[PDB]
């Protein structure tokens, strides 16, 4: 069957470079030649125990552009399951008798991995688990990097913002470190810098990285600028408003950027990216959210279909 046929998609750590390439290869075919009746008669459950409108809607629109049905929920301060006394294990054990696949986002880390031990042979796909993993975000980021730059190796990638707690930036660095020659520039407030584990990993593979202080410092060499949002709560309002002449992106700062340089942001972007960046050629955060559809179509198609010729 394909390598991922009914396999669980829980951590990017668990997927080899070849699996990442298979997903990104499929997503480019589904983007080119749609197959709207591919999962006809499958019912997927969209169990968002934690609410995320943009992630839930990208996923359910993936399910529906391949023809599947959707049952599910989002529990912001509401809706019965888990409850208290109702284990996650018993929720899964019961829902895996109803559906053909489970996409779930949950607030405690490893919830998706616990699910895997109770879903029978129903596959579970992680849409976010606490501060651990969010593999379908990384898959769409890499699809956006591959589709704009033409390759996933030998890139000068700048990562900016809360590097300490952006889950997406920890994942993207693992992933990009399965390909070759990538150079990393990490621009963070030192209260919010890369954990030494990402950094220690990167040196065992020999990957080059540098820490900088402002994007103006690397603007000129950079292919992908990946901005992350800075979490107001983890900072005092007065240090948050104090950091240099900031680390926000304005079109003035881009006047130096390479012609193929692209600004990606997992979104929301409250103020780290101004409105004028939106109209430069380098703005790519909204096209990046449209590629979410193609990345998650690819994962669902490969998981639920044995062989897929497209």
């Amino acid at each position: 069957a394909n390598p991922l046929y009914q396999k669980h998609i829980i951590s990017i750590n668990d997927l080899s470079r070849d699996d990442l390439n298979l997903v990104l290869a499929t997503a480019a075919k589904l983007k080119a030649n749609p197959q709207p009746e591919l999962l006809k008669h499958k019912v997927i459950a969209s169990c968002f125990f934690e609410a995320s409108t943009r992630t839930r809607l990208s996923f359910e629109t993936s399910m529906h552009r391949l023809g599947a049905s959707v049952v599910g929920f989002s529990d912001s301060a509401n809706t019965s399951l888990g409850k208290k006394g109702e284990t996650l294990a018993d929720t899964i054990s019961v829902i895996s008798t109803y559906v053909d696949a489970i996409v779930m986002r949950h607030p405690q880390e490893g919830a998706a991995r616990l699910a895997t031990e109770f879903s029978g042979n129903v596959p579970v796909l992680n849409a976010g688990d606490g501060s651990n993993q969010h593999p379908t975000q990384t898959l769409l980021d890499l699809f956006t990097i591959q589709e704009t730059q033409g390759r996933l190796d030998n890139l000068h990638v700048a990562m900016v913002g809360d590097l300490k707690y952006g889950r997406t930036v920890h994942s993207l660095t693992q992933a990009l470190a399965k390909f070759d020659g990538n150079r990393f520039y990490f621009i963070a407030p030192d209260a919010l810098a890369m954990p030494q584990y990402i950094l220690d990993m990167l040196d065992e593979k020999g990957i080059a990285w540098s820490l900088h202080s402002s994007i103006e410092e690397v603007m000129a060499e950079v292919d992908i600028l990946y901005m992350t949002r800075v979490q107001k709560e983890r900072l005092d309002p007065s240090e948050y408003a104090n950091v240099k002449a900031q680390f926000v992106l304005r079109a003035s700062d881009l006047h130096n950027a390479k012609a193929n340089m692209k600004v990606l942001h997992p979104l929301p972007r409250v103020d780290e990216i101004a409105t004028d960046v939106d109209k430069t050629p380098h703005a790519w955060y909204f096209q990046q959210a449209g590629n979410g559809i193609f990345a998650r179509q690819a994962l669902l198609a490969l998981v639920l279909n044995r062989d897929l010729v497209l």
Binding site: P237, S238, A241, N242, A245, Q246
Partner: protein, 153 residues
């Protein structure tokens, strides 16, 4: 006469001329310090030729003697601006801005939780040149910021 400079000069009889306003601060100064809220003659020149110091701005305010404290305020914006009083057709005092003790009114606390934002209060900051920068401490939240963080906002 002509190596153009003047052309039929707005020589005023009594007033203050603020000269060498270092380009683009010229309009700031009017808005911020509410200098047009008067009925006397002002003549403003923007982006004047001043080959000798690049490009500059210049406000001439008639029958007005903006002073001492008022002059020191401009230090944060136009640190090299020479004010000139005039009582009878020529310079009767040319004064430079010195960084003041406090900057009131004009300025906003970067601190979004600082109470000065929602309330009928005039901002106030204590000025301190920590040679390199000028730190400004808010009267209310008592938080201290680079004058550059405040002057962006």
């Amino acid at each position: 006469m002509t190596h153009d400079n003047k052309l039929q000069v707005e020589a005023i009889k009594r007033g203050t001329v603020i000269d060498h306003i270092p380009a683009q601060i010229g309009f700031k100064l009017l808005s911020l310090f509410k200098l047009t809220e008067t009925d006397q003659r002002i003549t403003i020149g923007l982006n004047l030729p001043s080959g000798e110091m690049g490009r500059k701005d210049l406000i001439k305010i008639e029958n007005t003697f903006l002073s001492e404290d008022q002059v020191d305020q401009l230090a944060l914006y136009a640190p090299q601006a020479t004010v000139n009083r005039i009582d009878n057709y020529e310079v009767v005092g040319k004064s430079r801005p010195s960084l003041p003790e406090r900057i009131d009114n004009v300025l906003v606390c970067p601190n979004s939780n600082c109470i000065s934002h929602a309330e009928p209060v005039s901002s106030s900051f204590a000025v301190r040149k920590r040679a390199n920068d000028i730190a400004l401490k808010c009267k209310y939240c008592e938080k201290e910021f680079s004058h550059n963080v405040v002057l962006a906002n």
